[PDB]
């Protein structure tokens, strides 16, 4: 419900 991923590689 609250998980946030660094999805786009551009965000290191």
């Amino acid at each position, epitope marked *: 419900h*609250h998980q*946030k991923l660094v999805f786009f590689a551009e965000d290191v």
Partner: antibody
Amino acid sequence: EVQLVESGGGLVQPGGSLRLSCAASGFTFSSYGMSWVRQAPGKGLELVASINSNGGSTYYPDSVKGRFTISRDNAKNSLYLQMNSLRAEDTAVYYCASGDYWGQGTTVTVSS
Amino acid sequence: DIVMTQSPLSLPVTPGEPASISCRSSQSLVYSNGDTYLHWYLQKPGQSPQLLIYKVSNRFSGVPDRFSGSGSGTDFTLKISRVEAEDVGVYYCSQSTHVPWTFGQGTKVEIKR
């Protein structure tokens, strides 16, 4: 609770203008890239515009480049899509997306 | 742009049987940190796309054990060990290693009868 609520959709005349807004919450908005993705009925997922953390840098496919502008407000935590010179093929459901999350989408209908 | 192409694009599955979907990228999806940003989406009928599997094999929240992912470089596979009625919809593979963010055509999974 990650949240992405879009607004600003509806009916637009050909060549007119429409502005999409996306309200984001539940995470540190300023740290992630965001995109607008659209979809025609019975069609695949089409990227409309991307923008990085600070924005910064943007991307537009030739489909909308020069007519569409994507922008970002890291205070309000809002994502915007400025749609100018709208034509018939712009008719679709538009999604505010973070890659790992998708909003419910808002419908844009270009018709006179 | 990184071309993502899936196979098959239409997948009728007899209830109780498993399912496989191929996905190939025109270039390697291995980023400079060793991670591979290849993902899978499921878009149930009349709904928004939802992240199913991220970075090749990692299940997102709520995703049951029957869904699994594997693959490396430019070749990737999504497996459903046993298709349930709830798994009906369109599956997209997607890469976020390169800009622009790109999607596959989408594979519509239906109930075979």
